[PDB]
Ligand binder design. Structure first.
Ligand code: FAD
Ligand code: FAD
Lengths: 529, 543
């Protein structure tokens, strides 16, 4: 008689799951395992959630529920409550002696509230509150400690800091559950506690869907996708170094990316980090990818450090997502919220096809290539529009499949509020024609995602306002009618904003310490230039 | 002076210079000095073979380089010996010169630096064998190359690596190369007083010569635009710090050489190519200054398509050097197309002497080609991307002349012109028929390329001066001018500045076609000197 609980919030996986393991630690003393998930209305980024990420979270629970079953032939499952947690955990500690509560660390400041709650309840009830660090690569408190009590605000720094520290920890053992106990619960208690019998739908949490590809959630599609990119990169690794001739940014590639699986924990990063690191494990690959050296996997590792970069940066700053109250975001003076502009930016009716391609794929699918996160974000902010970033942030945070709080704001702040990196204000990295013309030359993407534009020939599709009236007749696209005339004059805004940025840039000659590109080179790579 | 009679029999060591023109990381020198206690004096000798120090096929520019390069060491010596010791320059025959001098004084050792290039095995052995005869030690030390090429070749199982990739793999088993040797002690060394009659009979120079003494003439097919270089290990050493500094900046600076790390052709005289070519500068020293500067730091940036960390972006360039020399040691047909097991045999079209004689002159009508052949003639040195366009102009990239032609023109007028290095590059660039990318106009055409390397006509006007007046629009592709613009800018195609010699469009298609036409036959490529991959190609031009 006893029971330990693995309580998922982001772990969402069975491997390199250290708290999944601490909870099996006492299998021998007949100690039962309770797989718990709780929809407390905020957890797992379900406070501000669109329909697509919400489908994904249930896939991933669908997965772990299955997994748990078919390893103990229908014995234990995953229990999903819709509830308050500090309150659910109490009742269930009244129904069965509750030994340890096991959790993966959720460093983002916001979970510091919720988590506190039970941290306490355990104190209050004398329950071992188990917290294993495994969502991040390191223990962000060492990074912040090592760098002298404050998280590095620059990529160069962070790197230099985790190079003082060791390499990262390694994926903890595969979890053993074939031989393990399972809490059976008085069915009144289940009904009474709101425990689902049938895993819910978006519809149940009042989330509805208003799509040319899409994403399967969970640890499983996750490990699949890891081996598919692991191969293709061995294939490169092997074939001398090279990656063609096609390690330049293709936007119309598969549902390839593991970004939202990392965001929900479906895939350990320490797995990802090390399955790469191994694969290369020395061998001296003289050759780069995105301007980044590529020997030692240094090119695809780095990406996982970027994720670590922001997460870590955000640990003690709960204003991380806002502008004021936030000491590491420059106070740039964005203009007045223009709900008719904004509504244009969200709907993808701006008249700039690529942005409209990119904004519409976002809604329909919930995921967008790194280069496209750029163009749409710098378009909204400092690429003029010149509208503040907290607006592309609350939008992205809703309709993205990954949309990690720290990460999302991080990239947003970095990209739009670094007034000192002058390369960023160059329309050579801003303008979404001379770049759509590049990223998707035949208008194949644009036409996938902005269909009012099927019939426009490849001469016009990047810039259809060039079309003659007769041509607009002949191709079904009448600007102002079918496709919205440009919502702004870039020439005029581009300059408008530069001058505006210059202004501010000097009105303080010594920048304050903010979150920033580390140098122009790091801008080139962070943009694919 | 007195009983100098004793010292004659008492002994002497020769340190015989040919390449390795330097007093540092010159172990063959330290070798001679190894008997300072025995009372053995040093004899620093250089000799005008007829060949040796690449003098067989020389022009004014390199010849002069080789001399101030010698004036250097000569002073270098007196400098450290209050005029006591001096360098001795005989124009004569090695084996014979040495034999004589031996009677003048006992020789315990004759010390030289190695010379793997097969051309010298004849000259060298001559002495290897003379020492055997007079019971003199023939001392021979490897420097000039990074490694011992025989050990390089030994590892690749007896054949020399034919591909850059294959090369580093090989030298990666064999560890890092030897470190530079200690600085030399000449301050407290003895020297030799020769009988002045003997000095005369052996043609030993009193005053260091002019190129003209060797019937070498500072015309250079009629030329002198300029901004030139000087030889000497001092000069070399000067230039290594000068570049070194910069690198450290890029090193300290968050990696990257900033956006002017793309090739600038109107940069200065900076290149140490001609100094490592004459040993004026130790390659071992170049590599470990770089490798030291970068020791332990991870900086992820490329340059280059080559990583930057651990100096491996600059370190590699001396490995490129290593790659050709070492690949030539045992193949004395290296400079030739036939009898060369490693140069694919390729049906180059008959010599068109009018074509050649215009390629060498810079009268093609395609400026940057003209710009560069004329830089060659004028100055003696050419940027890499430049050597390329002109080599691919002559051979495969329009014109279809054998690479053997370009080679011997290049060996007449290059300040470096290593032998192995030159021919290798020439074959490697012109004869690699299975790398299709080299065929594409996108590295072939000199017009699209002049537009990228020399944007505003700067260079092309510096060197193709008949075109100072064409604007910038028409400067690059000046055949576009109306009859009156030509009247106007005082350059009328034909008169004034050559009408093109070939039809690139027509010729490039032709050439590619034949390269396919060759590629099919012979389905499976015969092992040859070729790039590792298409990515190597990319880094080897700048692209
Ligand atoms: C305005 C803006 C908002 C963004 N919001 C998010 C977000 O909410 N969540 C998110 O994870 N990424 C976000 N990104 C960053 C990035 O575009 C994605 O991580 C990337 O598209 C994921 O696909 P990938 O797996 O092919 O990339 P890869 O290049 O394959 O790298 C693998 C993983 O590295 C990590 N990574 C790569 N780039 C970054 C980066 N710049 N910052 C942090 N981690 C990185 C991600 O986990 C990524 O999945 C945003 C970028 C911008 C400019
Ligand atoms: C047709 C042709 C002929 C050439 N002939 C010669 C020659 O006779 N001698 C010569 O030294 N270089 C030769 N090169 C190679 C190269 O162009 C020069 O080494 C380079 O221009 C030297 O300038 P650098 O010192 O700035 O280059 P760096 O990039 O500073 O490298 C330093 C040194 O590395 C060596 N190195 C660099 N590239 C190469 C290369 N491709 N092959 C071999 N060694 C290399 C040279 O010693 C060079 O000085 C030739 C190139 C071509 C295309």
């Amino acid at each position: 008689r006893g029971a330990n609980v693995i309580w998922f919030r982001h772990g969402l996986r069975l491997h390199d799951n250290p708290a999944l393991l601490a909870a099996l630690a006492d299998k021998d003393q007949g100690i039962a395992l309770i797989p718990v998930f709780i929809f407390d209305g905020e957890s797992a980024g379900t406070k501000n959630v669109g329909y697509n990420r919400m489908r994904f979270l249930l896939d991933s629970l669908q997965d772990i529920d299955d997994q748990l079953q078919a390893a103990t032939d229908g014995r234990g499952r995953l229990l999903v409550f819709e509830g308050e947690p500090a309150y659910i955990f109490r009742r269930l500690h009244e129904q069965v002696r509750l030994h340890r509560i096991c959790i993966e660390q959720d460093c983002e400041p916001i979970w510091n509230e919720r988590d506190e709650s039970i941290r306490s309840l355990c104190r209050e009830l004398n329950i071992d509150f188990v917290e294993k660090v495994s969502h991040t690569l390191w223990d962000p408190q060492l990074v912040i400690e090592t760098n002298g009590g404050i998280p590095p605000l620059t990529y160069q720094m962070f790197l230099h800091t985790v190079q003082i520290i060791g390499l990262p920890p390694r994926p903890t053992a595969d979890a053993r559950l074939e031989d393990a106990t399972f809490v059976e619960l008085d069915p009144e208690f289940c009904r009474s506690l709101k425990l689902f019998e049938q895993l819910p739908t978006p519809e149940h949490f009042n989330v509805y869907g208003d799509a040319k590809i899409n994403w399967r959630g969970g640890e499983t599609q996750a490990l699949l996708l890891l081996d598919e990119r692991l191969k293709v990169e061995q294939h490169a690794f092997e074939r001398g170094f090279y990656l063609p001739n096609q390690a330049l940014p293709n936007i119309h590639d598969s549902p390839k990316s593991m970004s939202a699986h990392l965001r929900f924990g479906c895939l350990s990063v320490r797995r990802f980090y090390w399955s790469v690191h191994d694969l290369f494990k020395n061998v001296q690959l003289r050759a780069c990818v995105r301007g980044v050296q590529m020997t030692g996997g240094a090119h695809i590792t780095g990406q996982l450090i970027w994720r670590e970069y922001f997460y870590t940066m955000s640990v003690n700053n709960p204003n991380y997502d806002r502008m004021e109250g936030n000491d590491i975001c420059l106070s740039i003076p964005w203009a007045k919220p223009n709900e008719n502009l904004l509504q244009s930016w969200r709907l993808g009716q701006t008249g700039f096809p690529l942005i409209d391609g990119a904004m519409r794929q976002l809604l329909a699918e919930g995921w967008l290539h790194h280069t496209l996160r750029n163009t749409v974000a710098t378009f909204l902010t400092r690429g003029g529009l010149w509208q503040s970033w907290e607006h592309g942030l609350q939008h992205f945070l809703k309709y993205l499949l990954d949309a990690d709080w720290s990460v999302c704001a991080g990239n947003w702040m970095w990209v739009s509020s670094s007034a000192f990196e002058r390369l960023l204000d160059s329309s050579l990295v801003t303008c979404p024609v001379a770049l759509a013309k590049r990223l998707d030359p035949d208008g194949t993407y644009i036409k996938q995602y902005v269909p009012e534009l099927m019939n426009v020939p490849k001469e016009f599709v990047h810039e259809p306002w060039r079309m003659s009236a007769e041509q607009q007749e002949q191709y079904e696209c009448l600007i102002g009618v079918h496709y919205p005339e440009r919502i702004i004059d870039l020439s005029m805004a581009v300059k408008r904003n530069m001058l505006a940025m210059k202004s501010l840039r000097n009105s303080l000659i010594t920048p304050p310490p903010h979150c920033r590109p580390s140098n122009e080179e790091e801008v080139r790579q962070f943009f694919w230039l």
